[PDB]
């Protein structure tokens, strides 16, 4: 039990050190040394935790976790430790009243964290308004990155393709939504923009070049040339022809899995390996298309834009997550076969085709493009804020109460306690600012409980006021960064049942 | 500092002895003496508490609470201390992290108990179904109580008046809703049931005996000749006519009190004392009739049938609780005028007029009628049960959560803390049952939250089942007796800021 107490009582005692320092009106702390003449005073939470020597082996783990927030972003480092300490206060009450492995309680935090992120999205605002001023700055910054790069030949043509490849995304900025197709024997000025998912090495011979209402399924199997290495296995046969009969009997059992493919209502099947002529010929009568050379990367990028999933096995027929594309066009350019996928439901993606004169110009253009798009796409999550002043903090609290309706018997207290920790943020801010936490939070939750609540925490008048009129907002990137860091920080301490005392120095 | 611990934590140890003894499967306690050969084993809660000497001076308060509960009914005495212990256990969080005034917490219980009793009433069932057999047996029971009483002369006519005096109430069965009038010069066989609220005295002289569309207002004041004792005063005046000037000045001030009455638009007034001719003569032009000699019950019972208020003062003009009645008829029987009201809005009551031949028959008939009506009124609180097995305990938590929605900041944590103690009753009952209490109570709240209000916990199968099919019910009178006893016991204990040890007798 002391293993958890050292990670709870020991962490809360250390966590309460920087807890009162949250906010500009928070408390302060002095750091005293042995000689006492080297001391200093500061409000930094990360400095106080790292400077104070602690023989507690559980406290040293929290120090390494806080370093991730500084390197990734570097904002709100103190808020991560304060929120992580409040999660331990509720988790300690769940354990002592249970004495069951916390890993089950950890599963309740993952389901509750999903509802908190969805509640912040609907109420989120942005500074993206008047895109006409932001679009003119986006093309100018991209031309600066093109310096020293071979792409500097024509800045207007290359920056225009990157402009329509960002604002038209309307979604995640990850590079997995941008396909890079590069060919040889072409000019850089001939590059064009395409919204389709483009392959090479066209599939099939007698297969048609036009497919309407195509479905996408991901699977891994080898239907051609099984038994890769036959050396070393004892072969006892009366005739030589019986050797090939064993390979046909193994592929004969695949007919049940092939029959389940037609039951899925799909006209196209994707496989990484090849397919023998007999199972491929049956695909024509059943209307099944066989796509080859899907590799791995292109498989993951296709399932995300089409809303599909990837699996190497069949768990049960008529259960899966499938994508679709309306029109598939097969053309040929640059003396190489190409493929084109279009008509995807809610498809959001783009493809930039760069034509180089050699292999050296292709690798330098692809690496320089990712560095230029990463800086431009960084402003999407930057400057975007949400309504602050305890409002959004309470919105995450009432969103967990929705999950508290349908819940398991033993998972209810795990989810319900997560909402109590979210309400500890206005309690700490009210105590550090010199106000009554019990009076403000009580009136704050009753108003935000059902509907039409713009109210928030007002520290000037010492009461609950509307934050939209005062103009109090906080960044949305800071919201997700602290919640995701505090959720992973609490898992590290709970997943450790026994903590061995560290070697004293 | 230690007074709160002895009144809260110290009171828990007293309730811990009766905590595990609740229920047929509950545990037992041991009472051991110095000789140890006189001991015994029993589950009785009242015996264990009275036998063990208690050095805790705050524990003697709960001793008198169990004695009051035993007078009402000999069942549920153990559950009173257990329910009161859960309210004191949660009082620790009401101090440290709450800081809420204790009386405001007690006032929050009155608002929660009001919704808890109303929630149990709608969900209460009874064996009164097929009232044809139930209503017929009511007159036969009343005839058995007529033994040794002068009412035994005629069983059919006298018991019929007592039967209709109960079911026709449609409300509280207490004798405060029944009026008894003792008169002379008649026979007991001529008595009949009349709801017209007959009283002895008359009112008015030249005023008519019939009033249509009457407005009744109840107030208590002396408008005629205050300071009834004139002995000892000294009147210093220059002339005899100047002495009457002070009395005439009071008559001019009477218009201020009459103006507030005239603005209410009432033709009927209620006064306990008399009224001088001048303020009574002004009521003739306004058509205001004043009733005199209303005693005490006549003041309270008039506000119950007419929907009035018992306050004697006006806190603001044109705001008050007003009643009304269709027709006020004045008749004369037995050489005395009677007052029979007619057309009272939502009036529910009955008045049994006992007409005797002497004073000895009036006192014996009134005392015998109260004993006969007590048996009929007992059938309303007897045999009427509610769904048990965690059902009724969880339903009360839903009504508390309704009040917990709209609440101020001080009582927000007080009302919410009361809902936690309601779920502790099925938790403790599931402790000694050998099953998991945390899983059964959790799944019970989510089921009743949306629909399915009749569900409960099954002790045999350890799951949620229909209480109507299993046939497990608990008396409704027991539910109100425990809540009323716990509300009065916790009202005194929470107000305790210090402990004064009682003097040993």
């Amino acid at each position: 039990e002391n293993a958890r107490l050292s990670a709870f009582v020991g962490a809360i005692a250390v966590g309460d050190l920087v807890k009162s320092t949250l906010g500009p009106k928070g408390m302060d702390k002095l750091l005293q040394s042995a000689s006492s003449n080297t001391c200093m005073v500061t409000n930094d939470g990360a400095t106080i935790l790292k400077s104070i020597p602690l023989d507690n082996p559980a406290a040293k783990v929290l120090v390494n976790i806080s370093k991730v927030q500084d390197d990734e972003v570097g904002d709100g480092t103190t808020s991560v430790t304060v929120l992580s300490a409040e999660l331990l206060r509720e988790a300690e009450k769940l354990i002592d009243q249970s004495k069951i492995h916390p890993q089950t309680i950890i599963e309740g935090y993952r389901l509750a964290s999903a509802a908190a992120l969805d509640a912040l999205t609907k109420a989120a605002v942005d500074n993206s308004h008047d895109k006409t001023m932001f679009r003119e700055d986006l093309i100018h910054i991209a031309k600066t990155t093109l310096s020293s790069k071979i792409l500097s030949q024509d800045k207007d043509h290359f920056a225009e393709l990157a402009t329509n490849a960002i604002l038209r995304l309307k979604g995640s900025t990850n590079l997995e939504h941008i396909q890079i197709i590069k060919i040889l024997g072409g000019k850089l000025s001939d590059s064009f923009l395409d919204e389709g998912f483009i392959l090479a090495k066209k599939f099939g011979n007698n297969q048609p070049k036009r497919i309407e209402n195509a479905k996408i399924l991901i699977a891994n199997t080898t239907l051609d040339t099984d038994k890769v290495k036959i050396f070393g296995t004892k072969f006892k046969v009366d005739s030589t022809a019986k050797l090939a009969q064993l390979e046909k009997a193994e592929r004969e059992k695949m007919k049940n899995k092939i029959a389940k493919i037609s039951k899925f209502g799909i006209n196209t099947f994707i496989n990484r390996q090849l397919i023998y002529d007999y199972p491929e010929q049956l695909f024509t009568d059943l209307g099944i298309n066989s796509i080859e050379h899907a590799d791995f990367e292109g498989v993951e990028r296709l399932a995300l834009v089409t809303g599909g999933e990837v699996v190497s096995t069949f768990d049960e027929p008529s259960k899966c997550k499938l994508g679709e594309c309306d029109v598939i066009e097969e053309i040929m350019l640059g003396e190489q076969p190409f493929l084109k996928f279009s008509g995807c439901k809610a498809g959001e993606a783009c493809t930039i085709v760069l034509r180089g004169a050699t292999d050296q110009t292709l690798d330098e253009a692809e690496r320089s493009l990712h560095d230029a798009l990463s800086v431009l796409s960084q402003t999407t999550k930057e400057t975007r804020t949400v309504l602050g002043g305890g409002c959004a903090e309470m919105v995450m609290s009432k969103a967990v109460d929705t999950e508290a309706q349908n819940i398991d018997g033993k998972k209810s207290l795990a989810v319900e306690a997560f909402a109590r920790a979210l309400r500890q943020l206005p309690t700490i801010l009210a105590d550090n600012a010199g106000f009554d936490s019990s009076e403000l939070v009580s009136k704050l939750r009753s108003s935000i409980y059902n509907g039409i609540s713009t109210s928030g925490l007002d520290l000037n008048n010492g009461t609950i006021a509307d934050m939209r009129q005062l103009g109090i907002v906080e960044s949305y990137k800071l919201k997700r960064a602290v919640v995701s860091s505090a959720s992973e920080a609490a898992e590290v301490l709970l997943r450790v049942d026994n903590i061995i005392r560290a070697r004293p120095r | 500092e230690n007074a709160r611990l002895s009144a809260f934590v110290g009171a828990i140890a007293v309730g811990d002895l009766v905590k595990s003894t609740l229920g047929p499967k509950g545990m037992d306690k041991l009472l051991q003496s110095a000789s140890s050969n006189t001991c015994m084993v029993t589950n009785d809660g009242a015996t264990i508490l009275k036998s063990i000497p208690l050095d805790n001076p705050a524990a003697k308060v709960l001793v008198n609470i169990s004695k009051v509960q035993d007078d009402e009914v000999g069942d549920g005495t153990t559950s009173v201390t257990v329910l009161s212990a859960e309210l004191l256990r949660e009082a620790e969080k009401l101090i440290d992290q709450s800081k809420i005034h204790p009386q405001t917490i007690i006032e929050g219980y009155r608002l929660a108990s009001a919704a808890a009793l109303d929630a149990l009433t709608k969900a209460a069932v009874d064996n009164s179904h097929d009232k044809t057999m139930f209503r017929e047996d009511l007159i036969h029971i009343a005839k058995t109580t007529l033994s040794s009483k002068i009412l035994s002369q005629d069983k059919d006519h006298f018991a019929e008046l007592a039967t209709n005096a109960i079911l026709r109430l449609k409300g509280s069965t207490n004798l405060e809703h029944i009026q008894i009038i003792k008169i002379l010069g008649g026979k007991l066989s001529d008595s009949f049931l009349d709801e017209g609220f007959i009283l002895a005295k008359k009112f008015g002289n030249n005023q008519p005996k019939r009033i249509e569309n009457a407005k009744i207002l109840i107030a208590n004041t002396t408008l005629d000749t205050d300071k009834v004792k004139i002995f000892g005063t000294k009147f210093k005046v220059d002339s005899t006519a100047k002495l009457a000037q002070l009395e005439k000045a009071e008559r001019e001030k009477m218009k201020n009190k009459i103006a507030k009455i005239s603005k209410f638009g009432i033709n009927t007034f209620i006064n306990r004392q008399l009224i001088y001719d001048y303020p009574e003569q002004l009521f003739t032009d306004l058509g205001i009739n004043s009733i005199e000699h209303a005693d005490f019950e006549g003041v309270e019972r008039l506000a119950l049938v007419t929907g009035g208020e018992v306050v004697s003062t006006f806190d603001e003009p044109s705001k008050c609780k007003l009643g009304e009645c269709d027709v006020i008829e004045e008749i004369m029987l037995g050489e005395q005028p009677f007052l029979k009201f007619s057309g009272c809005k939502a009036g529910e009551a009955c008045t049994i007029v006992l007409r005797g031949a002497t004073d000895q028959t009036l006192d014996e008939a009134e005392r015998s009628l109260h004993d006969a009506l007590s048996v009929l009124s007992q059938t309303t609180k007897e045999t009427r049960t509610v769904l048990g097995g965690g059902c009724a305990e969880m339903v009360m938590s839903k009504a508390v959560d309704t009040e917990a929605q709209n609440i101020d900041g001080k009582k927000s944590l007080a009302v919410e803390a009361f809902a936690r103690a309601l779920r502790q009753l099925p938790t403790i009952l599931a402790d000694n049952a050998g099953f998991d209490s945390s899983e059964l109570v959790s799944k019970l709240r989510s089921s009743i939250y949306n629909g399915i209000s009749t569900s409960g916990l099954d002790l045999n199968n350890g799951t949620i089942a229909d209480m109507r099919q299993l046939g497990i019910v608990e008396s409704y009178k027991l539910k109100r007796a425990v809540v009323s006893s716990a509300s009065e016991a916790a009202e005194v204990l929470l107000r305790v800021d210090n402990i004064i040890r009682a003097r040993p007798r």
Partner: protein, 74 residues
């Protein structure tokens, strides 16, 4: 572990590695024939299945080419 997101990539690496080091006769795998090497930095998506020794080298002087010539169809 977080690796469970990319697990589909690491699944195909162990299929071809065991077949080469193990023969169907004895059906045994030697621990000395499996070189386990890792470094700090990068990501888990860049892991590739190599059929031979890594032997990290900077090629000494930078003038040396990054590829080995066939030496006239040798």
């Amino acid at each position: 572990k977080i690796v469970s997101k990319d697990h589909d990539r690491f699944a195909e690496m162990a299929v071809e590695a065991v077949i080469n080091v193990m023969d169907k006769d004895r059906k045994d795998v030697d621990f000395d024939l499996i070189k386990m090497q890792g470094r700090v930095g990068g990501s888990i998506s860049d892991s590739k299945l190599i059929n031979g020794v890594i032997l990290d080298k900077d090629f000494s002087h930078p003038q040396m080419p990054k590829c080995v010539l066939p030496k006239e169809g040798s």
